[PDB]
Each structure stands twice: as C-alpha cells, then as structure tokens.
Design an enzyme around this catalytic site. Structure first.
Site, PDB file in Angstrom:
ATOM      1  N   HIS D  88     -17.159  30.484 -10.764  1.00  0.00           N
ATOM      2  CA  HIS D  88     -17.717  30.062 -12.267  1.00  0.00           C
ATOM      3  C   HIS D  88     -17.287  30.595 -13.408  1.00  0.00           C
ATOM      4  O   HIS D  88     -16.757  31.654 -13.212  1.00  0.00           O
ATOM      5  CB  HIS D  88     -19.434  30.118 -11.920  1.00  0.00           C
ATOM      6  CG  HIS D  88     -20.099  29.395 -10.872  1.00  0.00           C
ATOM      7  ND1 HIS D  88     -20.147  28.104 -10.841  1.00  0.00           N
ATOM      8  CD2 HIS D  88     -20.623  29.963  -9.640  1.00  0.00           C
ATOM      9  CE1 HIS D  88     -20.741  27.696  -9.865  1.00  0.00           C
ATOM     10  NE2 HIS D  88     -21.043  28.849  -8.949  1.00  0.00           N
ATOM     11  N   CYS D 130     -15.484  26.356 -14.653  1.00  0.00           N
ATOM     12  CA  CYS D 130     -16.027  26.114 -15.906  1.00  0.00           C
ATOM     13  C   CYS D 130     -15.584  26.858 -17.355  1.00  0.00           C
ATOM     14  O   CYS D 130     -15.186  28.082 -17.055  1.00  0.00           O
ATOM     15  CB  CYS D 130     -17.812  25.856 -16.095  1.00  0.00           C
ATOM     16  SG  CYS D 130     -17.812  24.291 -15.233  1.00  0.00           S
TER      17      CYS D 130
END
Lengths: 93, 140, 92, 140
Positions: D88, D130
C-alpha cells in the site's frame, strides 16, 4: 477501447525536485545548452528518451558551477524525465 | 506498431514561454541569458518541424489562458504537441511575471478528456526552472 | 565529479495522486505487464523501451469492472522517472 | 559510450519487499495476490541475472534497514542495483506493516556520496503502490 486521461505526457525538467537549476555567466541555462546541442546533432535520428538521456549525461558531466561564495562553488545538476508515453517517439521518417 | 504515428500533415505546435522580467513584488530577478536560450530552442524546434510560437514575459493569467486556448484548438492534423517553459520556479510551481502558478494546472488542459484531438499523441513539456533550494555538491 | 542524484530510475505503477489496480484473483496490473514484457524482451530492449511497452500494456489491455459505479471501468497509467545518463540493457 | 557498462561479475542485487499483511493499527487490508506477483517478479528478475532476495511483511524500520545495509555492501563487481516494492502507498510514502515511510528516505541511501561502489551505475526502483485516491475515468 478507453485511454487513460494522463497517458502520453512527457515532462523533461532541467533539474530534479527540490533542487536548484544552473546557468553559466553570460550564456544561458545548462539544460537548454545541452538539449539544443543534442537536438541539433540527433533530433531527427534518436528516440526522445535517447535524446533526453544524452542530455542528462551532458548536464551531469560537462557542467560544474564556479563562484566566489563557497556555498555556491563547484555544484552539479541532474535533469529529470518523467514519462507517461505509450510508444517510442521519433521526430521524423 | 511500437512508435507514435508521425504521418500527419504537421509535426505540431511548439509553444515557448520566455519569462525574463518579473515584477519586483515577486522578489525575483531578471533572468539573464534566457533570450539566448529561447532563440536557440526556437531554432531547434523549428528545425524539427514544429510550428513554433514564442511568448515573452507572461503573467500567470496569460500562461494559463494561452495553454487553455492551445488545448482547445483542433490538433487532428498534428502528430504531437510541445511546450517549453523558461522561468523561475519552486517546487511544483512556475513563475509568471506577477507570481506563481502550479505546473500541473498548466499541463492539465491537455489531458485526454479535455483535449480530444491530442488523444494518443505525445504531449511534451520541457521545463526549465528552479525546483527548490537544494544544491548538488557532487562526488568522486 | 558526478551528481549525487544521477543514475536513478523509478518505475511507478501509477502517476502521482492516483489509485493502482489489481484484477480480482490475478495480482497487480503493472506487475502482470512488467513480467510479461521482461519475459519476452528483458534481454533485447533498453530499459525505457521496456517500460514504455509496459505503459502501453497497462493503458490498453486493462480496465476495471465493479458494481459500484464510482469504481467501474477505470484506467491507469504508470509513470517512469529517469535520471539515467546512459542506455541500459540487461546483457552483454 | 552511450550504454551502461555491463561487464561485471554480477548484474547485481535485487531486493523485493513483498508487504501483504498489515497491522490493524494502520487500517490497511490484506493485499491478496501479492505473493503471486512477488513470485513472478522473482522469476523475471532472476532470469535477467539479478541476485534476488524477497522479504515479506516488513516493518518500516526493517525496510529502511534492508536498504541501508544493501547500500553499505561492496557493489564493485555489480553492474547495477534494483529494488522492487510491493505494498500500500499514498503520495510519496509507502506502507510497512506498521505505518508509512517516505520513498525518498529508502532511496537516499544509494546516492552518489553515500554508496560509492554504485557510483555511475543504475539504481532502479520499481514501485507498486497506490499514490493517492484519484481514479482515471479514461476517454473515447
């Protein structure tokens, strides 16, 4: 058959984020000198990344600042290419 | 198949923004040498086949407006687009004569959804500006 | 004398500010494409040719599916940042 | 003259950080499929010639330590260095299992002045994360 809205941009910056960009006394910006010099020699026969990679090397090697202030003396610079291109780009043929 | 199609009536437009003189309230000095740079770049890019236009000492509203307008022209018969910015800068922003505008806001006009006639075509930005204060001391 | 920041390359799966996608059951789009191109061409193309092909494969081959309209039919483009000073081939 | 010298005993080291499971403290969900990604990347990179090592579910301190240590090895007989991050992320940062660390901090270990045996050699970072929450709607 959709295309991303951010695709097919290329940014060729004279220097990396956070950093200064240099000009030699009298003449102009180092990155511009180099870019023009490589485009004059190779703009019609190299791919855009080859051109800019050569520009990166020329700025990195050929140039180094001079100055009576130690804080600004003998510094260096490196440009920074950001590519979102999806193909090779030649300016010709 | 692996290169951008260059078989168009024209290579495309090249806009050059040559910012040399700044309003004193910005705190920025004259950029000596930039006329020589703009001239050399205008010749290189004309020589490549671009339709080059050079603007000089643009305000922030001017820089935004001319890029917006450029983005609204019909590029159907152009292969690509180029923009060259010569000015003072700080991180993520570029100076007009009267202040600072975000680089991303200038380029966004050319996004896929907002400039359909440049879809699938290279949008090139050459950006000559400071991007902060740091100096590379070098090594070896 | 060499700049301290020179000779880095960052290959990001997506551009700044943007989400990065994975297809249900088969891992990240950027990874699929990177592996697929490297396996075909990792030893015969320059690093930017490879990553440019990756850009195209991500841009074209993929598009999200979802029962929330807010996440349906989205797209992604990776982002290469090069400070390299030469061409890079993985061989010879 | 125009290519990086690859005539070295080793292509070089490739570190893969494969972050799948995150502390509830961080609010982040499991990243399914990432082991399959890491495996495929391990094969490709091994196949190119990298000495690949894979580290799983690294904390922020672990990620920093790995790269610091790698930066401190002798790369005299290596052509280059690669790091692949799977996790992430948000803009400019990447998640360890216990929080976020700045991408620039991980890379700074390899700077010219701080890792002399990779001077003039490519340092590659492949970053699957991300980078904020904008969605590209596409066009045409």
């Amino acid at each position: 058959y959709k295309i991303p809205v951010e695709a097919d941009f290329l940014f060729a910056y004279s220097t990396v984020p956070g950093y200064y960009s240099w000009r030699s006394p009298g003449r102009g910006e180092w990155f511009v000198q180099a870019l023009c010099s490589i485009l004059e020699e190779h703009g019609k026969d190299l791919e855009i990344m080859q051109i800019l990679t050569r520009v990166n090397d020329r700025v990195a090697r050929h140039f180094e600042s001079q100055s009576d202030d130690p804080h600004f003396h003998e510094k260096k610079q490196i440009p920074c290419v950001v590519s979102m291109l999806t193909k090779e780009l030649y300016f010709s043929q | 198949t692996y290169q951008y199609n260059m078989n168009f009536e024209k290579l495309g437009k090249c806009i050059i923004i040559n910012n040399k003189n700044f309003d004193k309230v910005t705190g920025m000095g004259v950029r000596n040498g930039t006329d020589k740079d703009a001239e050399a770049l205008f010749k290189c890019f004309r020589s490549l086949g671009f339709d080059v236009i050079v603007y000089n000492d643009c305000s922030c509203a001017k820089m935004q407006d001319l890029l917006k307008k450029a983005s609204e022209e019909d590029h159907t018969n152009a292969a690509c687009f180029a923009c060259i910015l010569l000015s003072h800068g700080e991180e993520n922003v570029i100076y007009g004569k009267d202040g600072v505008t975000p680089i991303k806001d200038l380029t966004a006009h050319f996004r896929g959804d907002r400039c359909k006639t440049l879809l699938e075509k290279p949008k090139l930005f050459f950006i000559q500006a400071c991007r902060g204060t740091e100096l590379d001391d070098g090594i070896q």
